[PDB]
Symmetry: C2
Subunit: 169 residues, 2 copies
């Protein structure tokens, strides 16, 4: 059955979190929407994007290339809805700003605003890691911007603990 989220911790009335691998979650949860932490060219070469793409047996990359052929690059802060392949009904590819290449961190709000087009989502934090935002800040922008139901997966235990303790204690 769809949207079978298990073992999440409520942070706010619409934001939940779990220490988990987003690919394993997608396969068990069968979400309506899984969010990808994308770049503007939808080149799924590492991180969450690479893991999602590999789990789709590269079908996500083939589809993404066809989308770029029609669209050109996405905007920073923008998104597109593509197939969820074997992971979800839909994949919402969202581009957060990459502060390490001089992009504007305020566009993280625009990135998360895209989640409001979907009633429930399985998602990673956006713009952290190689994109240079602080995960604590990214969680805050999510909490302040998303009003639909978001189930966040955080792979790293120490980071998960930092996010939860700082948020709730």
């Amino acid at each position: 059955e769809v949207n079978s989220f298990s073992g999440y911790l409520k942070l706010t009335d619409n934001v939940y979190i779990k220490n988990a691998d987003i690919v394993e979650e997608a396969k068990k949860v069968k979400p309506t929407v899984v969010v990808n932490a994308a770049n503007v060219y939808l080149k799924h070469g590492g991180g969450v994007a690479g893991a999602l793409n590999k789990a789709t047996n590269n079908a996500m990359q083939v589809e993404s290339d066809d989308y770029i052929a029609t669209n050109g690059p996405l905007k920073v802060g923008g998104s597109c809805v593509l197939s969820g392949h074997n992971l979800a009904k839909h994949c919402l590819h969202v581009v957060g700003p990459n502060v390490n290449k001089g992009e504007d961190i305020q566009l993280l709000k625009s990135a998360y605003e895209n989640f409001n087009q979907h009633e429930v989502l399985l998602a990673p934090l956006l713009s952290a890691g190689i994109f240079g935002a602080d995960p604590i800040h990214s969680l805050r922008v999510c909490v302040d911007t998303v009003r639909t139901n978001v189930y966040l997966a955080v792979f790293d235990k120490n980071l998960y603990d930092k996010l939860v303790s700082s948020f709730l204690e």
Copy 2:
């Protein structure tokens, strides 16, 4: 409000689990019952017992000594209901077998049977650690024996992951 368990993962219809510190859980959850992993003399010198006792500012040990003065030692597989102090309404002190001193592992069933006198409990796994049972086995005895609602706290992340993956995958 009481029994405010958050972020647990359902293993069976009545057994739930979380990677958490049982003392921190008791203070946040305000459970009707917290289970102590006790010995027959209710000497709370280490492990969960020492942590619970320290959180009660030693009131648990004072009360326990008074109980032993009246009762003598508990039986292996037995229990007693004492105050929950500042952690819970009640503390169910349960003695699992210590296989390392030649006690009978089958009395782990008797230990968990005591949970059926309580509609909901916050509890640790019994008889593992210094008592020498395998945690995976202890979880199984819990699942097979307890029919009331049990919320298990496992402090160690690697052990938690082993327990959950082996149970559900």
